[PDB]
Amino acid sequence: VHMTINERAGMSKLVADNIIASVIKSNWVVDILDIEYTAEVMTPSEGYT
Amino acid sequence: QVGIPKLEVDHISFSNVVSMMTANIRTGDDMAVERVNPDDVRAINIRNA
């Protein structure tokens, strides 16, 4: 299942947990469009900080 | 003939079949929920019924 979540709000925390669990055990691909984020491109020498 | 209702007539009957639960109905597993509030108060759609 390629589930799309246009907006997280009002979601049960148990349901969000169950969805991530599906992402892992059923290989769900879940695209959360609500999120905004900045990115940093680490060099291999610095690793994930 | 079918049996006359006990409440139909003026006799007193000192034995009757009382329906009853086998055990206490207050198990103690009271229902509990997860209320989860609107994210933005401005964003709420009061409209449409």
Curated annotation (Swiss-Prot), chain A:
Shown stretch of the complete protein: 1137 to 1185 of 1333
Function per UniProt: Inner capsid protein that self-assembles to form an icosahedral capsid with a T=2 symmetry, which consists of 120 copies of VP2, with channels at each of its five-fold vertices. This capsid constitutes the innermost concentric layer of the viral mature particle.
Name recorded for this polypeptide: Inner capsid protein VP1
Subunit structure comment from the entry: Homodecamer; each decamer is made up of two conformers of VP2, called VP2A and VP2B. 12 homodecamers assemble to form an icosahedral capsid.
Highest taxon, organism lineage: Viruses
Subcellular location: Virion
Highest classification ranks of the organism: Viruses, Riboviria, Orthornavirae, Duplornaviricota, Resentoviricetes
Family statement: Belongs to the turreted BTV-fold inner capsid family.
Curated annotation (Swiss-Prot), chain B:
Highest taxon listed in the record's lineage: Viruses
Coiled-coil regions listed: none
Subcellular location as annotated: Virion
Family of this protein: Belongs to the turreted BTV-fold inner capsid family.
Job of this protein: Inner capsid protein that self-assembles to form an icosahedral capsid with a T=2 symmetry, which consists of 120 copies of VP2, with channels at each of its five-fold vertices. This capsid constitutes the innermost concentric layer of the viral mature particle.
Subunit organization: Homodecamer; each decamer is made up of two conformers of VP2, called VP2A and VP2B. 12 homodecamers assemble to form an icosahedral capsid.
Protein name: Inner capsid protein VP1
Annotated source species: Bombyx mori cytoplasmic polyhedrosis virus (BmCPV)
